[PDB]
């Protein structure tokens, strides 16, 4: 007759009732995303509304159990997830208006087209047209046109919608006993109740800034090197002491500098590491590629893929007859149903990402015996970090040689090693200031510290100082360049990417130390290591049952995120950059601009 | 010579777990070597007698219990390891003299639309003593407040329904269970191999 016993029975009913409902919703949404028809979208929306209504009923019920009287930490967490008032704390009409503008922003982003003024018959959307320009074009004026057209068209539409989005989202979070929507987001990292492992919501800012400070020097040297190399590519357009023009960074926004590898390669004579030609020339089976990833995961002590996975997954492009969503996704449908949705091509990029998504599935396969509300990552960063450590091990030349796509020669000049590490940095460290600044601007906007009359002013002021990037043309408050990113216009938090980059190298260092690896960390392949496999499974099985701090300590020995894994991974490239920039400018002027008056 | 005695074993449909079925078997020629190369039994282990001596043994009374349960819950059909099935639905005596049989039905019990014909109990007042049933639709009320009328806030309907689709994981695919128990008596009936 205790409250705890009453709460236990309530949680049993919820778990057993919600498993099946979530399974029906997942099956319906899978049939849509793999088979776009009107019947399927209506079935998905029906199942989703049923699931949301059941969840809200259970929320009002779970709100009737006084949390403070609970002495069991696990049941308290599940109850808290259910008691979250969420959007329901908004009035009905205000919530409807918020959902309307949310879907509208998502639609205009994913559908916006810009047309070439010289030839108004050529029009491109973001994918694949505008992205192809920003990735491969070497023409400054064409790139500048692409950059300015995307922003000045779709972002201007997004501006007022985004203002209403900000104010309503902050109100909701405030009604949910938070300061703003960013604080709500910061609640994901909050730990309250476990003595010796708690971690407050202001500590994230402290840790992110304290750790970004240590990353700062490495990024500065990479920035100087890329700046000189780009000066050779766009003569008379780049100052040797100024910020980088935003439209020369490799994509529409600068989130990844991957497409700058051709312009910044240290040693052209040394061959770039690409195995695409080997895959096509070698007998390949798409089944087999995914089977090889499966063979990799079993070699470290993890289970096979399920027969349901191999039968229900979609591993090839279904063709022109069947249109599907081709964004690589790892589906955890529940009830032990695990699938991967991927329009796999025979390319090196897809090989590593197949490892990444199958890493997700193993995470998803793990912690299955946990209750429903605990079937989730330790925090928002754990799943992608796990996927990313898989792809590094698969990307190592030792693994590539052992699988048989590479020549047995294995030539490894100190220059081939620096080439690989430089390509890693364009991706890994190029995204961190972007990630840190976007969430910092968003957090500040939610806090009400950036007035409406200076959204773009503070955005580009912050742009210059942190990332070292300067706009090619001036933007007044009519523009809305922040809303021009997918994650921003689709209501997704972004700090997971900063946090996941650090977590992944912590895990990589730990598992390579477990595998008794001796050489440079970036040459480590955790293949054939049942010890490393067990240490990772020991963390995977917790789900969201234990605090993420306790789970991280269980594997790496530290209660918090650490930068030394990343810095030790990139130490050789760091010294090489420090030598390469002796006669180069280090730092950035906050005052240089491409444009004048 | 009158009883194939497996009109239970292979048939059209079975009963739910909370209302498991009993049947008497008599006047039979128990040959179970043809069932050794049958559809592979998910689990076939005997407790009181030897599987290499079955047909030689000529016991008196035999009873058959048939019902359907999920895949992860199947390993509870044994003395001890009390759980959801082993307490609220079907418990086995600690001293058990018999054998347990189970196999997998791929799409027999599973249909594309889904099968919602098998039920199971989740809420009961007490654990069931061996070989007991309680099919009562008594609205369970652990909280002191006895609604007793209908579905309530702290009240719950004690019977839930299995959902069986042809794409489920192995952990909860439809497993079909038959239990053989030989009561220990000093009175003879007609059974042997
Ligand atoms: C908070 O409540 C949960 C219940 O949801 C507690 O977890 C449970 O721990 C008990 C004791 O270890 C488990 O019982 C055992 O089950 C095994 C099953 O094989 C049985 O053989 C044992 O004799 C025993 O009865 C129970 O299964 C387990 N439940 C879950 C869902 O994990 C938890 O311990 C509580 N927190 C604290 C701090 O006590
Ligand atoms: C990367 O590998 C290359 C070789 O594979 C390393 O280069 C070598 O560097 C040494 C100096 O550390 C050079 O030695 C010197 O030779 C000059 C005459 O050429 C002499 O005047 C000096 O007193 C000194 O003895 C050596 O020639 C050079 N070899 C080649 C083939 O370039 C390089 O140091 C490695 N880089 C790193 C960061 O380890
Ligand atoms: C229940 O399951 C099936 C009916 O779906 C029956 O199983 C099989 O029945 C066939 C005949 O229809 C057996 O073939 C036979 O093989 C033996 C040698 O093994 C041969 O001597 C016979 O002349 C005949 O060709 C098949 O073996 C048999 N499989 C098993 C389980 O042994 C089964 O008899 C049904 N029984 C009941 C009680 O429902
Ligand atoms: C995509 O959805 C359609 C229905 O909207 C599925 O239907 C097919 O049409 C009839 C429907 O009874 C089936 O008998 C056909 O066999 C299906 N056509 C095929 C398989 O080409 C269709 O199956 C769905 N596609 C996928 C890949 O799930
Ligand atoms: C890591 O695991 C792979 C599994 O593919 C091992 O590869 C096999 O290696 C042995 C010994 O050289 C060969 O006889 C097999 O034919 C290989 N199987 C393949 C290539 O599929 C590899 O040796 C392991 N590396 C170790 C243990 O250091």
DSSP A181-249: HHHHHHGGG-B-SSTTT-B-SSHHHHHHHHHHHHHHHHHHHHHHHHHHHHHHHSTTT--TTSPEEGGGS
Distance to chain B for A411, nearest Cα, Å: 46
For CA atoms A150, A153, A158, A163, the dihedral sign is: positive
Quote the DSSP letter at residue A569. H
Quote the DSSP letter at residue B48. S
Residue B121: how many CA atoms within 13 Å on its side-chain side?
Answer: 25
Strand partners, B45: B100
Q: Residue A332 — φ and ψ, nearest 5°?
A: -110, 90
Touching check for A12 and chain B: CB below 8 Å? Answer: yes
- Provide the 3-class DSSP secondary structure of residue B67: strand
Residue A357 designated active-site = yes
Q: Residue B92 — φ and ψ, nearest 5°?
A: -110, 145
* CA dist., res. A348 & res. A330, Å (int): 19
User: Per the annotation, does A151 bind a ligand?
Assistant: yes
Q: Residue A361 — φ and ψ, nearest 5°?
A: -65, -35
* CA dist., res. A257 & res. B153, Å (int): 56
Pick the CATH number of A91-270+423-597 from 1.10.1740, 1.10.10, 1.10.1370, 1.10.287: 1.10.1370
The length of chain B is 193
- Answer whether B170 sits within 8 Å of A6, measured CB to CB: no
Distance of CA B165 to the CA centre of its chain: 21
* CA dist., res. A109 & res. A486, Å (int): 7
Q: Residue B171 — φ and ψ, nearest 5°?
A: -60, -20
- Answer whether A12 sits within 8 Å of B122, measured CB to CB: yes
* CA dist., res. A534 & res. A299, Å (int): 11
- Provide the 3-class DSSP secondary structure of residue B137: coil
CA distances, B65 to each of A178, B48, B86, B117, B172 (Å): 57, 17, 14, 19, 21
For CA atoms A326, A147, A99, A39, the dihedral sign is: negative
Q: Does B38 sit in the ligand 3 pocket, CB within 6 Å? A: yes
Residue A177 designated active-site = no
Nearest CA in chain B to A307: B169
Write down the experimental method used for this entry.
X-ray
Q: Is residue A500 within 8 Å of residue A427, measured between CB atoms?
A: no
Query: Who contacts A561 (Cβ-Cβ below 8 Å, separation ≥6)?
Result: A207, A211, A499, A502, A503, A506, A552
* CA dist., res. A383 & res. A504, Å (int): 10
Touching check for A16 and chain B: CB below 8 Å? Answer: yes
| Token pair listed for A471 | 């706009």
Pick the CATH number of B1-185 from 2.60.120.260, 1.10.630.10, 3.30.70.1840, 3.40.50.10860: 3.30.70.1840
Q: Residue A215 — φ and ψ, nearest 5°?
A: -75, -25
Measuring CA to CA, which residue among B63, B61, B102 is closest to residue B85? B102
Nearest CA in chain A to B168: A337
Q: Which residues of A touch B143 (CB under 8 A)?
A: 1, 6
- Residues with their C more than 2.5 Å from the N of the next written residue in chain A, i.e. before a break, are none
CA distances, A484 to each of A150, A154, A206, A427 (Å): 8, 7, 28, 20
Q: Is residue A17 within 8 Å of residue A54, measured between CB atoms?
A: yes
| Token pair listed for A309 | 């996975």
> Judging by beta carbons within 10 Å of its beta carbon (0-12, 13-18, 19+), is residue B160 exposed, middle or buried?
middle
CB-CB: which of B122, B154, B170 is closest to A16?
Answer: B122
- Provide the 3-class DSSP secondary structure of residue A444: helix
* CA dist., res. A180 & res. A173, Å (int): 5
* CA dist., res. B116 & res. B113, Å (int): 10
Distance to chain B for A354, nearest Cα, Å: 22
User: Per the annotation, does A328 bind a ligand?
Assistant: yes
Strand partners, B21: B66
Please state the atom number of ligand 5 nearest to the C-alpha of residue A403.
Answer: 20
* CA dist., res. A11 & res. A374, Å (int): 12
Q: Which residues of A touch B154 (CB under 8 A)?
A: 6, 10
> What are the extents of the domains in chain A?
3-84, 91-270+423-597, 274-412
The length of chain A is 597
Instruction: Count the neighbouring beta carbons within 10 Å of the beta carbon of residue A410.
Output: 11
Please tell me the number of the ligand nearest to residue A418's CA: 2
Please state the atom number of ligand 1 nearest to the C-alpha of residue A74.
Answer: 1
| Token pair listed for A7 | 């709460």
- If you search the block for the tokens 């300067």, which residue do you land on? A470
What is the count of residue pairs from A and B with beta carbons less than 8 Å apart?
45
| Token pair listed for A490 | 């689709």
CA of A426 relative to ligand 4 center, distance in Å:
44
> What are the extents of the domains in chain B?
1-185
CA of A17 relative to ligand 2 center, distance in Å:
70
Q: Is residue A524 within 8 Å of residue A508, measured between CB atoms?
A: yes
CB-CB: which of B123, B156, B167 is closest to A308?
Answer: B167
Instruction: Count the neighbouring beta carbons within 10 Å of the beta carbon of residue B31.
Output: 10
| Strands A244-245, A469-470: pairing kind | parallel
Q: Among the options A292, A357, A417, A509, which is catalytic?
A: A357
Please tell me the number of the ligand nearest to residue A34's CA: 4
* CA dist., res. B136 & res. B151, Å (int): 15
* CA dist., res. A379 & res. A376, Å (int): 8
Touching check for A311 and chain B: CB below 8 Å? Answer: yes
- Answer whether A16 sits within 8 Å of B160, measured CB to CB: yes
* CA dist., res. A585 & res. B127, Å (int): 78
Instruction: Count the neighbouring beta carbons within 10 Å of the beta carbon of residue B174.
Output: 21
Query: At CB < 8 Å, which residues of chain B contact A?
Result: 122-123, 142-144, 153-154, 156, 160, 163, 165, 167-172
DSSP sequence for A79-127: HHHHH--GGGGS-HHHHHHHHHHHHHHHHHHHH-EEE-SSSTT-EEEII
Q: Is the peptide bond before B135 cis (omega within 30 degrees of 0)?
A: no
CB-CB: which of B142, B160, B168 is closest to A5?
Answer: B142
Q: Where are the alpha helices (DSSP H) in A261-407?
A: 261-264, 276-281, 286-298, 307-312, 348-365, 382-395, 397-403
Atom 23 in ligand 4: residue holding the nearest Cα:
A35
- Provide the 3-class DSSP secondary structure of residue A574: helix
Conformation bin of residue A35: beta by default, left when phi > 0, alpha when psi is -120 to 50: beta
Distance of CA B99 to the CA centre of its chain: 12
Q: Among the options A19, A163, A171, A487, which is catalytic?
A: A487
């Amino acid at each position: 007759s205790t409250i705890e016993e009453q709460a236990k029975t309530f949680l049993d009913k919820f778990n057993h009732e919600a498993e099946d409902l979530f399974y029906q919703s997942s099956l319906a949404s899978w049939n849509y995303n793999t088979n776009i028809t009107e019947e399927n979208v209506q079935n998905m929306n029906n199942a989703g509304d049923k699931w949301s209504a059941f969840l809200k009923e259970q929320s009002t019920l779970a709100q009737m159990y006084p949390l403070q009287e609970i002495q069991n930490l696990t049941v308290k967490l599940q109850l808290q997830a259910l008691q979250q008032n969420g959007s329901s704390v908004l009035s009905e009409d205000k919530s409807k208006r918020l959902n309307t503008i949310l879907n509208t922003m998502s639609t205009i982003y994913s559908t916006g087209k810009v047309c070439n003024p010289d030839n108004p018959q050529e029009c491109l959307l973001l994918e694949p047209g505008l992205n192809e320009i920003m990735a491969n074009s070497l023409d400054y004026n064409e790139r500048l046109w692409a950059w300015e057209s995307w922003r000045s068209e779709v972002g201007k539409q997004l501006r007022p919608l985004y203002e209403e989005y900000v104010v309503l989202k902050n109100e909701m979070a405030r009604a949910n006993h938070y300061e703003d929507y960013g604080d709500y987001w910061r609640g994901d990292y909050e730990v309250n109740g476990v003595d010796g492992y708690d971690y407050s919501r202001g500590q994230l800012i402290e840790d992110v800034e304290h750790t970004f400070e240590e990353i700062k020097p490495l990024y500065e040297h990479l920035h100087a090197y890329v700046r000189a190399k780009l000066m050779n590519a766009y003569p008379s357009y780049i100052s040797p002491i100024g910020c980088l023009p935003a439209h020369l960074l490799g994509d529409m926004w600068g989130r990844f500098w991957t497409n700058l590898y051709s312009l910044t390669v240290p040693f052209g004579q040394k061959p770039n590491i690409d195995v695409t030609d080997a895959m096509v020339d070698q007998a390949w089976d798409a089944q087999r590629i995914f089977k090889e990833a499966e063979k990799f995961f079993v070699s470290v002590g993890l289970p096979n893929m399920t027969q349901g996975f191999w039968e229900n997954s979609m591993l090839t492009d279904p063709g022109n007859v069947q249109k599907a969503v081709c964004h690589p996704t790892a589906w955890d449908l529940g009830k032990g149903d695990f699938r991967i949705l991927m329009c796999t091509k025979v390319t090196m990029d897809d090989f590593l990402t197949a490892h990444h998504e199958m890493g997700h599935i193993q995470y998803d396969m793990a912690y299955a015996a946990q209750p429903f509300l605990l079937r989730n990552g330790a925090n928002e960063g754990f799943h992608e970090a796990v996927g990313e450590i898989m792809s590094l091990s698969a990307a190592t030349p030792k693994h590539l040689k052992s699988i048989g796509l590479l020549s047995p020669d294995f030539q490894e000049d100190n220059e081939t090693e620096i080439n690989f590490l430089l390509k890693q940095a364009l991706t890994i460290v190029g995204t961190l200031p972007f990630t840190y600044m976007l969430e910092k601007w968003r957090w500040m906007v939610f806090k009400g510290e950036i007035p409406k009359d200076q959204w773009m002013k503070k955005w580009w002021e912050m742009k210059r100082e942190i990332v070292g990037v300067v706009e090619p043309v001036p933007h007044d408050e009519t523009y809305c360049d922040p809303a021009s990113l997918f994650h921003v216009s689709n209501d997704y938090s972004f700090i997971r990417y900063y946090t996941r980059t650090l977590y992944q190298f912590q895990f990589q260092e730990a598992l390579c130390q477990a595998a008794k690896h001796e050489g440079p960390l970036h040459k480590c392949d955790i293949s054939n290591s049942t010890e490393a496999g067990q240490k990772l499974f020991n963390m995977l099985r917790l789900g969201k049952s234990e605090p993420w701090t306790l789970a991280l300590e269980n594997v790496v020995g530290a209660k918090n995120m650490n930068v030394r894994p990343l810095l030790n991974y990139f130490e050789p490239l760091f010294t090489w950059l420090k030598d390469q920039n002796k006669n180069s400018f280090v730092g950035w002027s906050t005052d240089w601009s491409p444009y004048a008056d | 010579n009158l009883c194939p005695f497996g009109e239970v074993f292979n048939a059209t449909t079975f009963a739910s777990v909370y209302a498991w079925n009993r049947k008497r078997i008599s006047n039979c020629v128990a040959d179970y070597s043809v069932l050794y190369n049958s559809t592979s039994f998910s689990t076939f282990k005997c407790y009181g007698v030897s599987p290499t001596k079955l047909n030689d043994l000529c016991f008196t009374n035999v009873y058959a219990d048939s019902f359907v349960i999920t895949g992860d819950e199947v390993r509870q059909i044994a003395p001890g390891q009390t759980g959801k099935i082993a307490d609220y639905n079907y418990k086995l005596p600690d001293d058990f003299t018999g054998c347990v049989i189970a196999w997998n039905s791929k799409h027999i019990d599973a249909k594309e639309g889904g099968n919602f014909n098998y039920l199971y109990r989740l809420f009961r007042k007490a654990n069931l003593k061996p070989f007991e049933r309680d099919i009562s639709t008594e609205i369970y009320q652990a909280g002191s407040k006895p609604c007793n009328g209908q579905t309530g806030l702290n009240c719950y309907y004690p019977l839930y329904r299995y959902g069986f689709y042809p794409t489920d994981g192995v952990g909860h695919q439809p497993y079909r269970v038959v239990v053989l128990s030989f009561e220990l008596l000093n009175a003879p009936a007609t059974v042997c191999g």
